[PDB]
Design a protein around this ligand. Structure first.
Ligand SMILES: COc1ccc(-c2ccc3nnc(C)n3n2)cc1OC
Length: 124
């Protein structure tokens, strides 16, 4: 059960813009979630081979992680702030999909999602 390549993070042909919303998403949202005690399973793509999770990429067809989001923000990959917010939401929902209600990893993702929402509440 091979891992897929990680999501694309840079496209020099995509037009680029700097907005207050995108700057906040990197400098506040991504930065704060990265430093959360429970962030470490979400800082890079799920390595289903190393973790012995052969069904991970049979269930999760839209993988996402904070390492990918960080790169997308740095590379001006997002034009709309909603694209970034959607990626964070895909990351949390993937965890809820693969796992089950009450699992430790689900409770960790729920705590990160609650911090995300406290930070997004304050978006420009
Ligand atoms: C670096 O180490 C790890 C990295 C990730 C996981 C892990 C396991 C199941 C799962 N379901 N959704 C997500 C996200 N994950 N992440 C576990 C790790 O070590 C035990």
């Amino acid at each position: 059960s091979m891992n897929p390549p990680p999501p694309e993070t840079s496209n020099p042909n995509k037009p680029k813009r700097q907005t207050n919303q995108l700057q906040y998403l990197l400098r506040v949202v991504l930065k704060t979630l990265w430093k959360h005690q429970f962030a470490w399973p979400f800082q890079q793509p799920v390595d289903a081979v190393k973790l012995n999770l052969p069904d991970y990429y049979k269930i999760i067809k839209t993988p996402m992680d904070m390492g990918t989001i960080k790169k997308r923000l740095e590379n001006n990959y997002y034009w709309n702030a909603q694209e970034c917010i959607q990626d964070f939401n895909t990351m949390f929902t993937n965890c809820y999909i693969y796992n089950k209600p009450g699992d430790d990893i689900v409770l960790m993702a729920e705590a990160l999602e609650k911090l995300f929402l406290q930070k997004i509440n304050e978006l420009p």
